[PDB]
Design a protein around this ligand. Structure first.
Ligand SMILES: *[C@@H]1O[C@H](CO)[C@@H](O[C@@H]2O[C@H](CO)[C@@H](O)[C@H](O)[C@H]2NC(C)=O)[C@H](O)[C@H]1NC(C)=O
Ligand SMILES: *[C@@H]1O[C@H](CO)[C@@H](O[C@@H]2O[C@H](CO)[C@@H](O)[C@H](O)[C@H]2NC(C)=O)[C@H](O)[C@H]1NC(C)=O
Ligand SMILES: *[C@@H]1O[C@H](CO)[C@@H](O[C@@H]2O[C@H](CO)[C@@H](O)[C@H](O)[C@H]2NC(C)=O)[C@H](O)[C@H]1NC(C)=O
Ligand SMILES: *[C@@H]1O[C@H](CO)[C@@H](O[C@@H]2O[C@H](CO)[C@@H](O)[C@H](O)[C@H]2NC(C)=O)[C@H](O)[C@H]1NC(C)=O
Ligand SMILES: *[C@@H]1O[C@H](CO)[C@@H](O[C@@H]2O[C@H](CO)[C@@H](O)[C@H](O)[C@H]2NC(C)=O)[C@H](O)[C@H]1NC(C)=O
Ligand SMILES: *[C@@H]1O[C@H](CO)[C@@H](O[C@@H]2O[C@H](CO)[C@@H](O)[C@H](O)[C@H]2NC(C)=O)[C@H](O)[C@H]1NC(C)=O
Lengths: 83, 228, 318
């Protein structure tokens, strides 16, 4: 239809899924909000729509050692629901 | 006991709030309702299609046309509507198969999580399963899984065996640990150190095959009282 | 085990009517068929994303193996990621992606297109390495709470206790057990490379989707009782009065071809979903713990398992 995107000064981004017009590509990484495809997600963040690469999770590194062990000293009772 | 009863009750009190505040917590059950209504609206709404005919009204076709030319016009309508019902019934059979699979899983979870204690990982909750409670929901069921989760871990130095009198001792149901100066034997899932005696350890072999053995003393309960 | 299948998208208007504007007007009065087909195919496409997320996103953190790789004598080199390769795939993983594998441009011009998966191969390989690193440095503890480290030989002593063998058997046979494991891992690589039909369960997934699309394309040369199988020919040869009884056969006939394809696609997605459900359960019970169920995690007495990523599926080493 008659509607047009500016295609200039609108922060055109190139993805493996296609051409995304109207969203700025940041270099940060957030949890997926709106799946675009090929590892790209989109979200509404501060008054604009931004596109990023989704992050699998928080980085961690178990301190593996040669003769070292870790033992808990407390516990928690957790109740979760399944539908 | 008193602390454990408190933790359980606080956990229960948050479930009443969690489902109430979160809107899409029951999205799975609302999907059953929506798909059924959307199919029936599509079946009803598909009655206005001409399917190539002059109109979508049978009475108008018969009153305005001669019989032999009316049959041609209504044949498209009858064939078009028979196709709609066949497609609707076919989709229902596919949906009913998906529901039956979920019903079979719910019956299994009832027998295993609710009627017993389960050793299968992540089958009944995230953590070590304790027990479960059922609740009835429209066109479904809801399970409350109670699980035991460790917290507040500590660093320790460990050894596979302890050497004493030229014999290698292994723990019976625990693990050897040390805070830096002394050696204890403790259960794996909870820190409760105890002195290494001949009651909670068993001897097997000598003191050179094991890679990582450690010199220590293995207390003998029989000896000290005998000397009294 | 297969985990997902190709995600396809169909242009209803272009497949049936081609480039004819006369057909486009007439397709409007046939009801909401193209709206149903899109809704069904979109549901399949989204479900494929969920299958992979359900199977591989079993852990919420991304673990890493320490720089020094010595775990009591066990190698693990053939399963850990290879830094030298840019793809960051393990040698067994890189071998798998080779075993499993104009026509595409011809299909695109009929309205048949293919959507790419949300999780790239790089992301799925990182899930497998995070899972692999967790189970080596922790055991089954990272699957039920905070990950608590433990030496690997002491972890294997725990796993013999779960099958009725006392601890001393491992400690007095540690060198023998390590060599048997290394030899078994090495033979898996060689036996897999030599046989090309070993990865047959995922080639069938790839073949069926490509074969069904080809039949849908070849269905456009049928006539369905019409004078011709070209829309432009019929409209340029007959008067609009009498051309309706001809175009109706072609439109209805091609609507049947589209409806049949979606129905078969829905049935296949149901089978794939069952397979993905089983793969997710095996990851929870074989990989994140030790299973006492008979013949669930390999044949014998289960000790542990290691996952590997493969195109449109997963591979477990029990
Ligand atoms: C158990 O000991 C290990 C060995 O030092 C600890 O690992 C380091 O802990 C510091 C503390 O902040 C971190 O900065 C390092 O990144 C850790 N090393 C690695 C390789 O991750 C470990 O923290 C100790 N356990 C606890 C609970 O602190
Ligand atoms: C294990 O955790 C519990 C709470 O999670 C600790 O109990 C606390 O004890 C202190 C003083 O004894 C009080 O603040 C409360 O009775 C408890 N806290 C709360 C918030 O209820 C318990 O002391 C911990 N045990 C160890 C060994 O650290
Ligand atoms: C390791 O644990 C042992 C046993 O609890 C500790 O030994 C005790 O240390 C306290 C500290 O004042 C003394 O009051 C006790 O008399 C000690 N027990 C005995 C039997 O002598 C030891 O201190 C701990 N190690 C560290 C580094 O705290
Ligand atoms: C601590 O780690 C070192 C290596 O990082 C281990 O040293 C090896 O021990 C085995 C067992 O006899 C020898 O066969 C190797 O030759 C040693 N060197 C290497 C480079 O592997 C050492 O065993 C570990 N300590 C414990 C208690 O297990
Ligand atoms: C644990 O005890 C044994 C004794 O059975 C120690 O072995 C002795 O080590 C000394 C050297 O410090 C040698 O001179 C002896 O000949 C060894 N044998 C005996 C029978 O004493 C062993 O060294 C001890 N462990 C450690 C770490 O020192
Ligand atoms: C783990 O196994 C791999 C192969 O299964 C070993 O890699 C071999 O290393 C030797 C010496 O560096 C080479 O001659 C071989 O060609 C390597 N094989 C391959 C397939 O590249 C590796 O050495 C083993 N790990 C350890 C610690 O020995």
């Amino acid at each position: 239809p008659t509607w047009r995107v500016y295609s200039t000064g609108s922060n055109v981004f190139q993805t493996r899924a296609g051409c995304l017009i109207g969203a700025e590509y940041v270099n940060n990484s957030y949890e997926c909000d709106i799946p675009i495809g090929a590892g790209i997600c989109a979200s509404y963040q501060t008054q604009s729509i931004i596109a990023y690469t989704m992050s699998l999770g928080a980085e961690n590194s178990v301190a593996y050692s040669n003769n070292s062990i870790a033992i808990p000293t407390n516990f928690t009772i957790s109740v979760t629901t399944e539908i | 006991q008193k602390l454990i009863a408190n933790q359980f009750n606080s956990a229960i009190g948050k479930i009443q709030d969690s489902l109430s505040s979160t809107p899409s917590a029951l999205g799975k059950l609302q999907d059953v309702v929506n798909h059924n209504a959307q199919a029936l609206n599509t079946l009803v709404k598909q009655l206005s299609s001409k399917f190539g005919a002059i109109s979508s009204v049978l009475n108008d076709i018969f009153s305005r046309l001669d019989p032999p030319e009316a049959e041609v016009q209504i044949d498209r309508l009858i064939t078009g509507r028979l196709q709609s019902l066949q497609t609707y019934v076919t989709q229902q059979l596919i949906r009913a198969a998906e529901i039956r699979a979920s019903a079979n899983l719910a019956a299994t979870k009832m027998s295993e999580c609710v009627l017993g204690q389960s050793k299968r990982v992540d089958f009944c909750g995230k953590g070590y399963h304790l027990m479960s409670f059922p609740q009835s929901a429209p066109h479904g069921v809801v399970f409350l899984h109670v699980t035991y989760v460790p917290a507040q871990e500590k660093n320790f130095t460990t050894a596979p065996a302890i050497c004493h009198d030229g014999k290698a001792h292994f723990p019976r149901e625990g693990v050897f640990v040390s805070n830096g100066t002394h050696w204890f034997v403790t259960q794996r899932n909870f820190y409760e150190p105890q002195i290494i005696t001949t009651d909670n350890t068993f001897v097997s072999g000598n003191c050179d095959v094991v890679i990582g053995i450690v010199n220590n003393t293995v207390y003998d309960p029989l000896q000290p009282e005998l000397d009294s | 085990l297969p985990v997902s299948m190709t995600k396809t998208s169909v242009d209803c208007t272009m497949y049936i009517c081609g480039d004819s504007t006369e057909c486009s007007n007439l397709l409007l009065q046939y009801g909401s068929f193209c709206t149903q087909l899109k809704r069904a195919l979109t549901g399949i496409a989204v479900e494929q994303d969920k299958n992979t997320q359900e199977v591989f996103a079993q852990v919420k953190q991304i673990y890493k193996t320490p720089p020094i790789k010595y775990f009591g004598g066990f190698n693990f080199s053939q399963i850990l990621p290879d830094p030298s390769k840019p793809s960051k795939r393990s040698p067994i993983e890189d071998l798998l992606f080779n075993k499993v594998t104009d026509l595409i441009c011809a299909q695109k011009f009929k309205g048949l297109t293919v959507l790419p998966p949300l999780l790239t191969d790089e992301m799925i390989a990182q899930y497998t390495s995070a899972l692999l690193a967790g189970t080596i440095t922790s055991g089954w503890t990272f699957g039920a709470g905070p990950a608590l480290q433990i030496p690997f030989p002491m972890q294997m002593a725990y796993r013999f206790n779960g099958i009725g063998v006392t601890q001393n058997v491992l400690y007095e046979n540690q060198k023998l057990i390590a060599n048997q494991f290394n030899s078994a891992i090495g033979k898996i690589q060689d036996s897999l490379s030599s046989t090309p039909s070993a990865l047959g369960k995922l080639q069938d997934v790839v073949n069926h989707n490509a074969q069904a699309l080809n039949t849908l394309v070849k269905q456009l040369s049928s006539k369905f009782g019409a004078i011709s199988s070209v829309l432009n020919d019929i409209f340029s040869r007959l008067d609009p009065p009498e051309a309706e009884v001809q175009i109706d056969r072609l439109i209805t006939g091609r609507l049947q071809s589209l409806q049949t394809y979606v129905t078969q696609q829905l049935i296949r997605a149901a089978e794939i979903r069952a397979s993905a459900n089983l793969a997710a359960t095996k990851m929870s019970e074989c990989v994140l713990g030790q299973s006492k169920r008979v013949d669930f995690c390999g044949k014998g007495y289960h000790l542990m398992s290691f996952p590997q990523s493969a195109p449109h599926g997963v591979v477990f080493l029990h």
